[model samples]
Structure formats: structure tokens, C-alpha cells
Target: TIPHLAIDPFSLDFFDDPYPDQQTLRDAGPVVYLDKWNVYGVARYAEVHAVLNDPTTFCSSRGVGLSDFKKEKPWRPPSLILEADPPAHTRPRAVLSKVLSPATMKTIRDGFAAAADAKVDELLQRGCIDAIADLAEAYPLSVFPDAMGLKQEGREHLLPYAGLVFNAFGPPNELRQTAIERSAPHQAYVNEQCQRPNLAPGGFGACIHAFTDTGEITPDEAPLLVRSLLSAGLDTTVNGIGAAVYCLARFPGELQRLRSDPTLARNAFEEAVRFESPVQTFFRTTTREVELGGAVIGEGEKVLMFLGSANRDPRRWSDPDLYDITRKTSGHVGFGSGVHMCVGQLVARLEGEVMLSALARKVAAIDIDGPVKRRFNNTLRGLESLPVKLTPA
Candidate 1:
């Protein structure tokens, strides 16, 4: 018999502080049925990773959100890359894989690093700042759009657009309704910026538009693909930086350890991701009857993967909840796994490494100066306000 709970994972209680309920879901069983939503949840690292890796069984094509594309009208056009299964997913994936390859990333590394340095210099003068608004959100806003070659006018739409996309992954709760209302004007701005004429020369946007010439994707498809960047790129990195800062403030010892060896910057970011997962939950539909944790999940059913719970599963991690920069973070599903693994992760890492490395070099320590405020979203995990006092070295 499957363990069942009436808990609503998207509710404000769950989003406010998810760990206690997360443990409840994990302890219930590897596969627990949420009676409230009639969906299955996989909480352990082993099962969640297995499900992410075996997309053939737990497919994304139907929709990665609560409203299956087959059964309901999607709120927006489906992402060709994020929402499609293989064969159809292949070409867009190939184009993005090449566009964000390690080689291409290397070319942007120094530029991103330089941008990081400039931002840190501005923050250092302030001494005390809101880690979320002043640093986390500000740094990405400074760099990512320019890299995309987007026009500067009305660029503020990026975050709300991303917030709306992530919130839509959940049920039509009030949070989703609020985002829908806030994003209307911004949504039009986003669509206009995706056009080729609005994109700057020699940036990721232009590069994706250029692919149309090589017959990689249609000219019409190129803009939608660029739209994917607008949706996924900014907010993920913004929250990631917020997570890093929050973790370091709470675990000063780990921050000290990272400061001692500046090279550990990327590791610190990965550890923060493992410690405080930025994107908490994603759903996949079963293509056929599949066995997981001694129970068979039926076809066309939704399986919610608790990525935050998986990242901290004791069965898979040693002292899982402890934030340690020295631990090996490889194989963590914080970025998902297999064919659907995040395409823009390297760029995220580049931004994280540069920003955190600059912080380590200039600041002696990070201290919490006020009560922390949490931002609630159905799919994303991050802070609304993180008051921090940075002690300069």
C-alpha cells in the first residue's frame, strides 16, 4: 500500500520552511501518494535521480507542470527544449548545447569575471546590504542581458517573466495568479526583445538567431528558443547567488573555509545548491507502468520529484544537511540529470564562481544583520530579503 498525505506542497506553509514537511514526505516512503493532489512524490536521492535519469519512463513531453499539455491548454507556448521529448527535443537541445558549450563559456569567463569585480566594488563600499536585492539580483541584472545582446529599454521584465514561468509549474494558486497579473506588460516586452532586430550583434541572442542560417532551426523557432533564455537564465542565477550568500551567513565556518582557499568558489556555490536547492520541485508524467521503491506507478500519472529533499537525503549524502564546501558535489540533482539536465548550468557556474570568488577576496566575513525574509514560489526556493553585514578583510 502506498503511504498517503493530505499535504499541499505548493501551500505557503510548505514554501515558507519546507524541510520539516520534506522530512515527513521522505519518511513516509520512497514513493508517497499525495491525497490532496492525487500525485506521487519521490523524495529520496536514489529514486529522484533515477526518475530524472530515466526520462523515457517519466516523460517531460506531456508537460513538466501540473496541467498536462495533452489535457489542458498551456498558459504560454511550450518550450521546445524544456517541454519536448527526444527526437523533437534533439535539435533545439543540440543548438543550445553548442551555444552554451565549455569552449564558448571560456570566451565569456573573463567578461563575466570582470563584471563580477565591478559589482563587488560597488557593494563593498556599502558594507551592509540586502544580499538578495543589492547583490544577488543586481549582479545578474548587470551582466546577463548585455550578454544576450538585448535592448536596454524595459529589460526589467526578465525576472517577472521568469517568476511567472516557474510559478505556472504549480497549481493555479494565488501566487500563480499574482504572477500572471504582474507579468502581462513585461511579457509583451520579452516577446519584442526576442526578435532578431532587437538583439545585439555577437551575443548569445544573435548566435541563436544565426543558427537559422545553418538550417538548425527555423527563423520563427529561433526567437522562441531565445525566449527560453529569457525565461530560464536570469532568475535561476539570481536565486543561486542568494542561496550562496544565505548559506555562508548561517555557516560562517564554511565561509571561512572557502575564504582560505579562493579556488573553492565554485565548490562553495555547488555546496550552497546542495544545501539550499534554488529550484525545489519539478513534475514528470509516467509514460507507462513503472516500478519505483517497490510500488508500481501507473501510466499518465504525475510524479513530483522533491529535488530539495533529494539533495539532502541522508541515504545518499554523509551528514547531508551540513553545509560543507569540501564535500564532493558531483551527481547532485540540484541541476537535474541525464538528457534534460540544465543547458545553461555552465553559465550559472561561471557567474557564481566569479561573484563568490570576488566576495571571498574582498570580505573577511558575512554576518546576518537582520531577520531574513523568505520568498514563496511554487517551484523556486530563495530569499526576498537577506540583510547582510560584510566585514572587509
Candidate 2:
């Protein structure tokens, strides 16, 4: 027997409004088997974290997308770091991690913070602008390509391209069709950026080339890694920052709190991620029969990790549904847990903290001027527009 497949939760309608169903699923059970998709659901915080951290049992190689890796032809070559497990997954991640390390990333802090301040200033200048398009999407798209050493023109397509990639992860619904059509016009620019001649000397794209030079990966594989960075990096952070804005706006008291103390930027960003996970779900396949939460997840079965649900699972957090910045939410699976967690998360967090903090510094109050618009991508939780009227401090 199948549990109630709340079509709204899995549909674009749901992305426009997800909490009603999220709460429903949360109350339903720890694991709700969706009959429509024939996939198991792990909607609570504990179950979700269990899936992400237990990679040995919940293998990502089966595919992180909805299309079973066993059957689907990947749009690009599989991401070696994202798609492989230890021994194989270890080296690429380690190599890239060191390059993007905390110390290394620290170098860009002042620059990014300055950029964040500029972007916030620009938004305030516009007076009652859409935060998602103007501030949230604009900041990362500006900084990330630079950090990656990509000097290419036509990088404006990054957000849409990443949005389309994530949308392709869900059912082939209108959201998927909409994204596919939107991405068609920018195909050539993205294709050109993937080529070696198009890559900058010191960027992630170039480092990918170095990996091939050192015999760590094939030369052709460089573009695929770049594709991974583009796909995973863009929309997730934009939506994440958007979510933070929504949370702060929704809870005026929190915005006031943040405005009073800038250090709360880190806590606010982390807490926002924990509260409304931007990258909602990722998949993993069972390596073998493994027992979790009393269910025997079998070998070859696809396991979906509900990052959104896990972040709010009360089992893992006190007053889980409430968005409180004071919570010591360090170990939360916001960036995820275990080996395959997001590599660029630090970058994403920096943007959120800097941008949100800057906006908070300027504003005495942040209020949604009207209804928000959400874009429903397969794996992402993002806003299309968040109209806000900031009351200046």
C-alpha cells in the first residue's frame, strides 16, 4: 500500500508552497513510500541525515538524479568526484578541497564582502526591487566565476543554466519543459566555456585541466567537472540566500536581531540553511541490504536523501520548525554530511552571510511588499522574485 502521494508537494504548485505538505509528510512517518514514484521517502530530519552520512549503505553512484543511473544517459559525463565513492571519490574531492580550503577561501573574504555591500547598495538604490533576481542571483554569479578564474564573457547564463540542470532532476513536468526551453538559447555559450581555449589559466576549469595533465583524469573529463561546479553551485546558493531573506522578512524580529549584531550573520545564514534547505533532495542507491529506521533498504534500490526535511526534523533540533538564529546548528546537514557533501558550500555561505549581513546593516526592517514567486526546479528550492521594501536604519 502506498502512502498519500501529495502531488502538490512534488509539483510546481508545491514549490510555490511546500510547508503544508512538508509538515504533512513529517507527521506521516519517518519513511513514507511514495507509490507514484515507487521510491522510499525519508522526510524527517533524522532519516534524512542518516541517508546522507551513511554513504556506504546509501550509495550516491546509483545516481543523485531521479533517472536511475542504471538507465539514464547523463546529460554530461558523470562528475567523477560527485559520482564516485572512496578511493575514486577521495582523490578528486581532496584535491579540489585543498584548493578551495578555508585558508584559501579566506583570501577572497574582503573582496566578496565588498562586492556584497555593493550589490546590496545597488538593490537599495533601485528602491523596492526583487531580491532574488537583483541581489541573490547577482552576487554569486559575479563572485564565483571570478573565484574559479573564469574570465569568459556570456557567463550571465550561469543561473539559468544551473536552474535547468536541477529542474531536469524531477519528473518531466512543465517545470522541466520550461527550463529546457529557456536553456536552449544559451547552449552555444555554455559549450564554448567548456572548451580548453575558453578556460582561464588559474580557474577551476584550468585546475581541472591540471588534473588531466597529472594523469588524475582524462583531458575530456575537465569540462564535466566544470559542469558539476556550474550545476551544483549556482541556483542552490541563490535560492539559499533568497530563503534567508524570506525567513528574515517573514520574521521581522529576527531581522531586527541580525541588524543589531552583525556576528549573527554566520548563525543566521547557517540557521536559514537548516530551516529551509535550498537543495531539497539528492538520491543514493543502496550498496547492499541495510537496515535503517527499521526498514531494510535493499541493494540497488534508490534512496532519496531529504535534505530539506532533515534540516527541520525535530528529532535533530529543538523547536525544529521555528527559524531561530540562536540555535547552535553547526553540525546540521545544511551543506550536508559525509564525504560527498557540497565542495563549494563555504563559498555559498560566505555569499549569504556577507550579502545578508550587508543588507541587514542597511535596513531597520525588511518586509515582503507582495506575494513571492517561486521557481520549481527538480532538486532546488528557489524563489523567482522576492519583492521587498527595506526600511533603512
Candidate 3:
């Protein structure tokens, strides 16, 4: 029999401190049932890694949330990359992958570097600031839209739209509904931005639109792919950058280590991804009856994989709870694994490396100056505000 838990993982209490509950889930067994949502939870690294890799068995087509697409109509159209499976997932993933490849990152690097440096300079001048709002969120909004060739107006919608997209992944709780109401205008603006005419002539969104000629993806599917890039790029990187700053803020020595050798910035950011795991959890449905972690999961059943927990599994890591910037972080599922892996991760990394490296070069320390607030969401983990005093180099 599968071990069943009564815990409501989406509860604010759990969000405030999830490690204890996550530890309980990991210790329970390979797979545990959560009676609150009537779905299975996989917290251990082994099972989660295996499952994410073999997407055909534990597919994403059924929707990556509590509501199964087979039974419920998704409130909005499903994401081209995040929610689709197999043949549907393949082409969009390929097109988006090529669009966001290393060459694209090279083209976009100067803007990100300049923005990070300028933001850090401003933060140093202020001396005390909320890193989340001033640096983390503002940096992405500044450079990403310019890279995507989005018009300067109405760009504030990105973060709110991010809240809507991420919050929608969970049950129809008040958080999700509230997000829907708050993000209504932002959603319309985003939908408008996704269209070919709205996209800039030679930007990333237009690049996605250009794929229409090869029949790799049709014209109707074009905007959806651009939407995928927008959705995947913004909040996750904001939180990922936020996670890195939060990590170094709490452990000041880590920043010193990065300062000693600024090249550590990449691995430093990588370790924060492993430690903080901004994209905390995802759900996959079984394609058919399958044996996983010694239990038989029936067809179309949802299994929740805790990406944060897997990254912290003691079995897979030494001193898993500790944040060491030099930690080997390659296999962590923070950006996910296999074909459905986050297509925008390269962009996210470049964003993180640029920001962190800038901090390494210029900032002496990031000291917590006030109460830090965590931004609550169903699946994404990040801070809302991080008050800190910066010491200039």
C-alpha cells in the first residue's frame, strides 16, 4: 500500500517552512499519497530523476497540475512546452531550443551585463535597498523585454503574468483565483505582445515567428511558442537571481569566496539553484499503469515531484542543507530534466552569472537590513522583498 499523507502541501504553513514536511515525505518511502489532493508525491531524488527522464511513461500532456486535462478544461490554453507531450511537445521544444541557444545568449549578453552593472551601481549608491524589487525583478524586466524586442510600454505585466502562470499550476485555491483577477489586464497585454505584428522585427519573439516557413511549426502555433519563452524566462530567473542573493546575504562568507575569485560566480549561482530551487515542484501523469518506486500507479494518475526536495536529498548530496557555492550542481532538477526541461534555462543562467559576477566584482557584502518577505506561490519558491545594505568594493 502507498503511504498516504494528509498534508496540504499548498498551505501557507508549508510554504513558510517546507523542509520539515519535505523531509517527512522523503523519509516516508519512494512514493507517498497525499489525500488532501488525492495525488501522489515523490520527494526522493532517485524516483524523481528517473521519472523526469522517462517522460513517455510519466507524461506531461495531461497537464502539470492538480487538474488533469482529460477531466478538466484548462483555464487558459496549455503551454506549448510545459504542458504538451510527445509529438506535440517535440516540435515546439525544438523550435524554442534553437531560438534560445548559445548563439542567442551571446547576442544578448552585452545588454544583461550592462544592466546588471548599472543596477548594482545604483544599489551601491542607495546603500540599503530591497534586493528583490530593486535588483532581482528590475534587472530582468529591463533587459529581457529589450532582448525579446517588446515595446517599452505595458512591460510591467510580465511579473504579474508570471504569478498567474505559476499560481495556475496548483489547485483552484484562493491564491490561484486571486492571481487570475489581479493579472487580468497583464494577461491581455501579454497575449497582445505574443502576436507576430506586436513582436519586434528581429528579436527573439520574431525569431520564433520566423519558423513558420519550414512548416516545423504552423503560424497559429507561433505566438504560443513566443509565450512559452516569455513565461519561462521571467519569474524563474527573477527568483533564481533572488535565491542567489538571499543565499549570499544569509551566508556572507560565500560572497567573500566569490569575491576572492570572481570566476566562482557561475558555480555560485549554480549552487543557489540547487539550494533554493526556485521552480520547486511539478506534476506528471502516468501514461498507463506503471510500476514506480515499488507502487503501481494507474493510468492518468498525477504524481507530484518535489524539485526542491530532490535537490536537498541527503542521499544524493553531501551536507545537502548547507549552501556551498562550489557544489557540483549539474544533475539537480531545478530547471527540470529531459525534453520538458526548461527551454529558457540558458537565458536564466546568463542572467544569473551576469548579476552574480557583477556583485562579486563590485559589492563587498550584502547585509540583511530588515525583515525579508517570501513571495508565496503554488509551485515557485522566491522572495517578495529582501532588504539589504550593500558594501561597495
Candidate 4:
């Protein structure tokens, strides 16, 4: 029998702390029917994994949010990559894959690493600072926009714009509405900045625009594609960095272990991602009838896959709740899986990896000495302020 609940996943209570609510969904069954949103939620690892992998059966083209594009009006034009499925998703994905390739990562590596080291040194001098504001937000805000060849003047719009997009992925609550109202300026600025002329030479934006020269994508599609890249890198990267630092600060043992090896920097960031799951929930629409986790779901149904719940599933992990940097996290859906897996994951991971490496090398301890502020939203999980006392090694 299919389990059911009236739990409002988009409620402020759920946003504040989701683990208990996520557990309710997981314990219900592999596939639980939520009456509040008329959506199916998959909280277990195996089922969530299967749903993500089969993109055709569970399509993204219709829309990857609760409001189906087939039925309702979207707030903005849908994402060419994120909101699209195969064929339509193919060419744009190809251009982005090339632009954000391993070769591209090598070119941007020293730039990101240098900036992280410098930021760590500066924060170390202060000895006590908000990790979220100083290291997490500050690091990516500098490196990513520079890497994108964006101008320094209107960079203030980045986070607000990203927050707007993320919240739009959920129900049209007061939070989403307020974000829309406050982010009007951000919306306008981000739209203008995504254009070809606004981008600098030899940046990721230019690289994407250059694809138009070779007919990979149209001139009309270029800016949207650039926005696609920006959305991928901006908000999520900041959250991942914050989550990693929070994990280190929360569990001194994990931080001590990361410092002892230093090489576990990448692993530390990965484990934090698995533990906190910055991009917590993603919705996928069914193109045709499909059966999963013993429930037969019909066409035009919206399925909410709990990446946060799946990562911490005891069935898939030994001490699932424990934050162990050494844990093998190969199949975790934190960045998702299958054809539509996050295109900007490598960029996000690189940012977190480098920042954590710098912190492990330079700081003896990251003590969360003051009140930690929460930046709650419908989709993304992140901190508004993470106050910390850093001891120099």
C-alpha cells in the first residue's frame, strides 16, 4: 500500500530544520503520497537514484517545479538546461559541458586557489569572523564572477537573483512572493549582465557565446545559456562552502581529521555536501506512467526526490547521521544523477575543496562561538551568517 501524509514540505517549519520532517517522509515508505502538494516524495536512496537516472520516464522538460509549465504560467522563461529534457536539452548541455570541462577547470584552478588562500589569510588575520559572510560568500563572489568575466559594479544582484530562482522552484508561498518583490532589481540586473556585451574576454560567458559562432546554439539562446551557467555557480556554490565550514565547525573531530591529512580536503567538502545537502529537493514531472518504490504513479505527476534524506539513509550508510569525511560518497545524489545531473557540480566542488584546503592548512579550529543565522528558503539550504572564532595553527 502507498503511504500518505499532509506534511507541507514548503512550510517555514520545514525550512528551519528539515531532518525530522524528512524522516517522516522516509519512514512512511519509499514512495509517500503528499496530499498538501499532490506530489510523490522519494526519500530512500535506491528509489531516488532510479528516478533521477531515468530522465525520459520522469521528464524535466515539462518543468522541474511544482507548477507544471504544461498547465500554468512560469514566472520567467524556463531554463534551457535545467528545465529541459533530452533533444531540447542536448545541444545546450553540449555547449555547457565544453565550457565547463576538465580543461576549463585546470585553467581556472590557480585563480580559484589563489583567491581562496588570500581570503583565508585575510580572515585569519581577523581571527574571528562570520564564516558564511567572510569565507563562503566572499570567496565565490570574487572568484566566480571574475571567472565569468562579469563586471564588479552589479555583483550585488547575484545572491538575490539565485535565491529568487531557487524559491521559485517550490510553491508560491509568502517567502516566494517576497523574494519576487525584493529581487526585482536583482532580476533586472542579472538579465542585463548575462548578455554577450556585458561579459569580458576569455571568460566562461564569452566561451558560451562563442559557441554561437560555430552554430552550437543560436545568438538568441546564448544569454539564457549564460544565465544557466550563472545560476548553476552562484547560490549553490556559496551554500556548499558554508555547509563544509559548518560541518568542520560543528564537529571538531572531523575538522581535526581534515587538518591531520590535509589531502582529505576534497573528501571533507564531499562529506559535508552529503551531510548537509545544500540543494535539498528537486521536482521531476512524469512524462508517462511509471512505477517506483511499489507505487504506480500516473502521467503528469510531480515527484519530489529528497536528496538530503537519501544521503542520510541508514539503509545505504552505516552511521548515516554521522559526519565522517572518510565515508565513501560515490553514489550520493547531492549533485543528482543521470543525464540532468548538475552541470556546475565540478565548479561548486572545486570552490569548496580549495576553500576547505586553505582553512585546514591555516586555521587550528573553527569554533561557532556566536549565534548562527539561517537563510531559509523553499529549495536551497544555506546559512545567512555563521559566526566563528578561528584559532591560528
Per-prediction tally of clashes: 0, 2, 0, 0
lDDT of 1 by residue, 340-368 (tens): 89999999999999998998888888989
lDDT of 4 at 231: 73
Model 4: lDDT to the true structure: 0.89
Candidate 3 global CA lDDT score: 0.90
Off by over 4 Å in 1: none
Every candidate's lDDT: 0.90, 0.76, 0.90, 0.89
> What TM-score would every model get versus the actual structure?
0.98, 0.92, 0.98, 0.98
Alpha-carbon error at 161 in model 2, in Å? 1.3
What is candidate 3's lDDT per residue for 308-350, written digit by digit as tens? 9999999899999999998888899998999888888889889
User: What lDDT is reached at residue 355 by model 4?
Assistant: 91
